Amino acid sequence: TVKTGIAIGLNKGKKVTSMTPAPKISYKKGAASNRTKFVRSLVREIAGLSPYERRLIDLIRNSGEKRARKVAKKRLGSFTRAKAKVEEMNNIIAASRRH
């Protein structure tokens, strides 16, 4: 990591020789996979949308996304979830309704 060799600093520590080994899978437990891709899209088309998912696209197209992230944080938990969750929402909004 290359520190400073002293007590404090922007790199508070000692400068010792680096090693670095092989990579781990205890870092990809949430990966893409061709197996889970096939599976997860297939079931989104078979069941349809939930009650709030209809009224979700209606409050974006018609009003806003500051509005969707506002009621999605009330339907779920995080703003971080609203990020990727409402992000994924417009993925179907475009790649389907027009194109």
């Binding site: 197996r35 599976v39 079931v43 078979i46 069941a47 939930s50 998912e53």
Partner: protein, 203 residues
């Protein structure tokens, strides 16, 4: 890979097709016994992933349980304590509904070594689960390098104790700085630090 499809299928519970079947099944069990065994699991996916092999020595038991809270057993709300300890309605419980259904099937099926159940139904007055127990005396299973521990006397009444996942979740024997409330035995860790340990040589 049918299991993969069934798994993401049991996550689309807010869809039009799932609301359908959990509303059909929930009702038919309401006209049956409260305590009524099952000849086949309604969820092959959940059943097998917990631990379920199709054979002579694995019984399923459909269980319909009630909810609400736990009113204290006092004559007319009559308590006899201090204001803090004087309620009847905001009276919960220290165990989950999952763990409760197991307690009652272990009294009916006293001869089987209970394993684990799961969530299936629930509308308003009733919640549904379905547990799986094993045969501690059947020959085919009495052997087997997977379940030889079932015939050991140390598992008699796993729900009355909490050797189950739902019991080890309700108890809280996990790893964490927040889980250091009772990381090792409730009253055990209690009595431990709350005891005076003195040696012949007091230092």
């Amino acid at each position: 890979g049918a299991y993969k499809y069934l798994e993401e299928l049991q996550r689309k519970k807010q869809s039009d097709v799932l609301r359908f079947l959990q509303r059909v099944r929930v009702w038919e069990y309401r006209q049956k016994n409260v305590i009524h065994r099952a000849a086949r699991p309604t969820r092959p996916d959940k059943a097998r992933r917990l631990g379920y092999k199709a054979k002579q020595g694995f019984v399923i038991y459909r269980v319909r349980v009630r909810r609400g809270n736990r009113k204290r057993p006092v004559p007319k709300g009559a308590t006899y304590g201090k204001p803090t300890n004087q309620g009847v309605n905001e009276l919960k419980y220290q165990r989950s509904l999952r763990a409760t259904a197991e307690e009652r099937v272990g009294r009916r099926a006293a001869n089987l070594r209970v394993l684990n159940s799961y969530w299936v139904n629930q509308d308003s007055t009733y919640k549904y689960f379905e547990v799986i127990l094993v045969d501690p005396q059947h020959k085919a299973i009495r052997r087997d390098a997977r379940y030889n521990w079932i015939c050991d006397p140390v598992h008699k009444h796993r729900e009355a104790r909490g050797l189950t996942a739902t019991g080890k979740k309700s108890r809280g024997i996990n790893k964490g700085h927040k889980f250091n409330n009772t990381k090792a035995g409730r009253r055990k860790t209690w009595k431990r630090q709350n005891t005076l340990s003195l040696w012949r040589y007091r230092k």
